[model samples]
Target: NACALTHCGILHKEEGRLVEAAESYQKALMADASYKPAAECLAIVLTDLGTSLKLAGNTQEGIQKYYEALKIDPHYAPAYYNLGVVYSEMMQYDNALSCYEKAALERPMYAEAYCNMGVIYKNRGDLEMAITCYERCLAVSPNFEIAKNNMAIALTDLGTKVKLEGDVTQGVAYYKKALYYNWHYADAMYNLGVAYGEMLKFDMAIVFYELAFHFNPHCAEACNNLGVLYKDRDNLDKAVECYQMALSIKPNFAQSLNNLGVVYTVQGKMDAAASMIEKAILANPTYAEAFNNLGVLYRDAGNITMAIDAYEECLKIDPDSRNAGQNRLLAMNYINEGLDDKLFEAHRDWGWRFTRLHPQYTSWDNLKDPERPITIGYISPDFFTHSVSYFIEAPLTHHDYTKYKVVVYSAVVKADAKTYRFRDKVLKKGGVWKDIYGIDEKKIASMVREDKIDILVELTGHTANNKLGTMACRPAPVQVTWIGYPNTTGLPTVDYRITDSLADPPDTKQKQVEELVRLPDCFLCYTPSPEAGPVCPTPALSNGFVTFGSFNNLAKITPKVLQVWARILCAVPNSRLVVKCKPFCCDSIRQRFLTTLEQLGLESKRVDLLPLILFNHDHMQAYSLMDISLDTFPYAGTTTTCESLYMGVPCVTMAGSVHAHNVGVSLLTKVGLGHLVAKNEDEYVQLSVDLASDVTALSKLRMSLRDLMAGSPVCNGPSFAVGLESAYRNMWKKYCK
Candidate 1:
């Protein structure tokens, strides 16, 4: 009867009926108190029932049950083990440790109780004690995989503590030893990868990440990090493959989804890119980078309003996210101009997050004599083959070596032929070039201060990869901003912002953090590319219809810009508008644009939606296909305006409320085309239509525009250099005072 009762208790225990199992085992024990099997079985059932009662907050009753089982069999180890678990769940680590000791004392080969005590020691931050307990557990039961993993985990934990105390070399040894204990320890391998990454040994990091992912094939973070390293190396296909693998293992992995979307963006698959990033946002609404990436896609697709909302969403999740806030402020430029107070407050709010308690250098090593040759340093990330370089190269090439020594501190990590050319000539010509790429900001400040830079000019405003942190260090006495962006830098540390009177008139409601330093002719001069082909004859003469075009970023093509441009096309009969940009290569994006034009009363036949051009020669040649170029506002095209003019096409620009809006007014006015400038929307449409009326006059205008550019203040590089020096000299003189 005792044997049958114990067998029935085992059946009930296997099916999770703990109360019935306990009752059957108790009855078996009562049938024969000396039956050893019945005593052991009864102890097991009672312990399990006690655990269930403890889980239900019946802690005192469960403790009472453990005592009753121990009274039935005084040497039952499981009864004491159950008491240890109850105390551990109650967070009484000391009492749990004492209880587990009694269980191990009664049963010397109890590996499970030893492992449980190891966890308690680990929870108390005693890694060495936990490791000893794990060793003891493994020694008694050599095949205990849980004890093995926990031992490796404790060893790796000590390595983390060592690494935190600044001994990376020995910490790596600890990780290696941890892996020696358990060959497939994924976290140990992952930590080695991070240590290599911290030391910038990326290849070694890649190898370890690969090894970790191999051991733990479903590690989402390992695959995601490998994809990022591939992305950093510009291996787009391999990056996408790793990202896809991570998503397969964990479908809702937000980081992998976002990274794959970025690669799709780089590949110019805008529609697919949108779908991937949208999924990432849905997977984790609290994902701040996902929201920021969503804004980037919207900004790319010419939807600034949606872009603004996405950026704001990101900021709400992470209020001090610099990337989101900067993009949010930059987005303000594309929408409209009349909200100076709103934009100014927003920029100031962004600036307020940064601490401005930098070590100020009140004294400079330069001579106070105003005529002494002064070294002026320009800092930028776009000193390579960028639009900013096109504008900046002119002044750099034409600087008066006797009066001003040019020093360039470039943050451009990716160098090009143009970058080498600047370093090639500028270095030999007694100018200084400092490659600040990948260097720490504080180190850069020390370098600038030691280089004795008299005037530090920030050429990158809030754009990509700027050194605003170094600028905030006040490395030089006179800090000025120019040419890289149209609006203020929103930096109180920047002393002045260079502009022209037309772009930033005194009466304009536009505000700036730095004081305005309006140059005489124009703020920046245009430099035509050597790859530009000769200007062809106006196409209207042969086509019998005016072709108006815009080569601007599609993001600037606001609804108002589209409507105004549509009105221009309607005002001129049988005219065609050519819209050429990179995104037009995607049919979905093109169809959206065409769909919007149709809504605004423009037919599909009159619009030519062209894709990307291969070379600068081909790009400039496309401009010859047009009779006139239309500028987008209130964020007028800076590079496009200059490129169009250099290609012998006249641009009709409308004046708006700020420097960004009035860039066309300055560019055209200096190029001797002030007559093309309009103060209202009606005049903007009227000017383009009137310019198209006479083909012969248009041809005459085309033939003479290049010569006008050659002779005008906008393209006179030497005078532009001299004018900038005048501003620099004035700023220095004031600093010397």
Candidate 2:
């Protein structure tokens, strides 16, 4: 009976009589809705009814027809969706949202249905899964009014998580595909940054993050992350600006406030650092990172106990923070002398704990010819203008390129004049170079392995952006650490610390994780800056009183070092001191250190606390004013020691039980200035005071010291490289055997 009614309705609908077909399907829907035949009959009736495309003028009628059609065939996918989609057009978005969401799981072909799927899967991070569904619906029918948004958003959605699959370029494929179709898609513009962000190409990524603000107005996420990357990448003022921009739009934001605090901490503005840090903590009481940054702030202020407390509190608050835990490890260095055991313990245990979690390999595919021109890769974050670079430049330029192939894995965040200088030198020698700044450490390890490096030389251990992250994988046949860091890497994979007998003595109770390869001379060489004008006349020659100074880092100016220096100041009759450091820019740091010095018998007025130098010329020239340059104890100044010597100021240093303490001993002894090396606090003070006793003697030494240093083995760059390469060959031969 319904079949006959449907036929009559179809014939009537063919003539554009909607009421008859609606009447036909209503009865057909009831009878055949219970079975497949009746379901097909109603679909035909409805299709015939709506093919006029003039349906739903009465929202009630179209809704009822599709609603009755679903009653006939509840299992039919399109009918209920059609029913739900009608209610949406009538200002009942709730019905459409619920129905569209329900039908989205069914993999509907409608453009709007897939549009909703894209949003849901974007949340799921499996955006490619469904955004593909609605995209095909556009192929069938030209006009799906709202579905134009489906492709761009759906394409952009998967680009973020798809990267985690190891198909790094596959993610880019979809992102640019989205852009290819419509560059106007703002979120699409934003997610291109997402891919670059994960790549750790922070400089390249920052450009993309800035691009989206013009296209997409609301991008505090871009501002927040971009702000953070600029903080440590040698971009100082730019960091605070992004943080301010973050708060400008994301008003009263807890995360944004702390972001500013870290930048302020770097900026030497302790007032703003503590201010922004506290502001965020008040809003986000549970913020662990905020408290951790407070540790850095107090660390700058030279309050070790307070920083330790902050680190402890932060650790308890958040167990997942790598930086909070590392803050504890880094904090130990500043506490006091006799810190070697605990410092070495924390570094080794931290290294092994993480190293144990990673894959350990005892084999490599690299050619085992120990005497060949073996590939030696040197890795560092300070390939730019840094103390590390100055110390590193000499051996590199003087390196025996015929016997040793050089490779530089530069993880440098910012490029400077030295960056190109290092690259060109290596490039001129036909050595390979990897700019690993933006690459992931994991990827960097893989890249190292890919290059088949024979002996990997690590230059940054326990320093900023520690390349131990890549070295953790043991990417080469053998590994060694030197120059840029003191002490052991504590990694079992790291085999040696290239030192001399004096830097690490033959007998000491102190432990070293790596085996000692004591080179013939000093294990390091110095490169004096060309900008250093000829060493000026000794200031003590002109001044009525001797001027003794130290240009070591503020953190290195430990209480023990300051106290020892204080003793020196008191011993030398009418001797004044000049101490220059970056953190001295902080008023509290300057005043507090002055107060500490005055308490130790060196009056505040007698010691001039100086800030950062504007130029290298001024920096080297600054050393000229001092008749005697002082060194920090237990962790002696390496660059400052070399720098002061090169600038014609003899730096008096002391020896301690461990390698960190004895660096200056090896350096001074290598330069034939061994008499200036102090064995204890008494010698350290007397050695400094003795140099200041006679103005003519100080003047004669200052005038002749430059030539003396130039003649010494420490300044013999080629010989130092020869000694280093010999160690590398010897270590590689062992691995080969």
Candidate 3:
């Protein structure tokens, strides 16, 4: 009768009714207390009941049932294995390991128990012991898929660990082994992609990332990494596609969201970039990368306080973020209200932190030459149609090759017509052109030292795609900062900053981070486009109202500058201002400008905001609409000032303490327009109003301004080159001493 009752319990258990099966088994065990078959069947039924209770959210009751079953039959291995599974679910790895070991001891052929023990070992970070357990399980059951999968994962984990320890070759071999065991292992494929990416083999990384997505389309990390590779390759469209796919799969993926924001920034979608980066920080508040990117966005928008705050928050999260630190120091220089000592301290702090992580090269062979033909190297990322190229072109073309052999190390990845022109000009003059884009900083520095450069000039300071790290290695006997950036390099290795007396006077020497090396008349020489349109007369002569304009980067248009401009606009009644910058492409940015003007009591009708024009001719023609140009302070416009003057628009500038703020003085003084340079905010307003009030005088100056610039020292390339070479010779003589 007890046997029949046990058969009834088996039927109920097979039908998935664990409660009914347990009740029937209990009744059978009570009916025949001495029956061994009934006791064994009841023990099995109790284990099944325990699993069902645990799956249905009753862990305490489940553990009790598992213990009760063992009491009925102490040798039941299935009850021990089931109890191990429950303990593992609760993350009690030690208890799970104990139960699993007991099950294996009770039943020597327990393959499942051995496999579970391997999982516990792997979770506990013991890959060697985990692999041993998996081998034992496989020996018992040759066709265990769970054992195979767990072994593959353990191998991949070991590979990642080794890769981080600088054994990439060994790590790739382990990752290959993981893939060999399980052909569909998506994680192994993704890890291989990451290793290849770290090695800078982006082509191989892309191939493996594609394979990983093919196998597991839900892999968001694979998609995100693929986007980074594409972005580096300058395939922006493909990068956008991959990032969107990643965000779709994992909406809260902060890394992908931050990466997408960077792509948007490169594409000139400032508003969209800000929105995505804000969302990334919202999704993960402690994301340092997101905060760093947000700082860049704010800096570009001319919000210095917000940019500083964002970078400060980023540093709080990750103190060693070199990019954020460098950017914050650069932003501080833009604030007119900041003290010289505070700015110097910020730059020095960044320099100390950066150089500590990347030490300078102490083994470079010293050069001692004062009279011989010296090898001069120039490094920059802005060889394309950028502001740096506009000033550098003439000097490079007219450099006295008999005294100096030129070598250009270009770090520009995006080559355009201007890049090819620069290459052609340098090569035509027997100069060596090295495409140093994407090369490691250490390798580039090594190459510079091997080339035996006597003097290396850095055109890009802390701006985008700079080679300051290479310069930090002290690759040459003399390193100079000039042209591209307006402020100090803050690098001890950079021995000089080429400037003019008007831009950096003798009195300002203590305020500078680098020793001043003055050019005779001007630091820069202007080279206008050959296809430039002719100068037009001032618009005020015909329009009856002065049309003031500025084509400088919107980032230079700080709130302080805006307030000054607003006062000038109010003073010059009925005069309209035309502000042209890149950020006006977004309606929200335009609205913000309008709102600021409105809050300052300046009517919106007196202002006109325009987006940047693509063509040089079109951009030049827009200058004809303005009677006079207004220069930004604390971060004055160099290229924009030169361009406006070339187009016959006289720009009024406010002089400040630093070299960046005094560049306008240099340019204006050189062109015999020193009267346009104001000493303070009130003088700036008065100068603008006085200039706007005299329409006839403005018209006459506009007609002759281009001729004055052409005849002046600012556009005398040959003269500037003579002075530049003389300075270089003087620097070399000092180094020889």
lDDT of all the models against the reference? 0.85, 0.76, 0.87
Ordered by lDDT, highest first, the candidates read 3, 1, 2
TM-score of 1: 0.84
- Model 1 off-target regions past 4 Å? 1-126, 136-150, 157-171, 355-363
The alpha-carbon RMSD values of the candidates against the true structure, listed in the order shown, are 6.8, 8.8, 5.8
Per-residue CA lDDT of candidate 3, range 371-466, in tens? 888889999998888888898898779898876999999888789988988889888888999999889999999999889888899998888778
Q: Residue-wise lDDT of candidate 1 within 594-616, one digit each (tens)?
A: 99999989998999999987576
Q: Number of clashes in model 1?
A: 0
Query: TM-score, each model?
Result: 0.84, 0.72, 0.83
Model 3 local distance difference test score: 0.87
Residue pairs that clash (backbone atoms under 3 angstroms), model 2: 32-38, 33-72
Query: Which pairs of residues collide in model 3?
Result: none
Find the candidate with the highest lDDT and give its number: 3
Off by over 4 Å in 2: 1-239, 245-251, 317-320, 336-340
Q: lDDT, candidate 1, residue 411?
A: 88
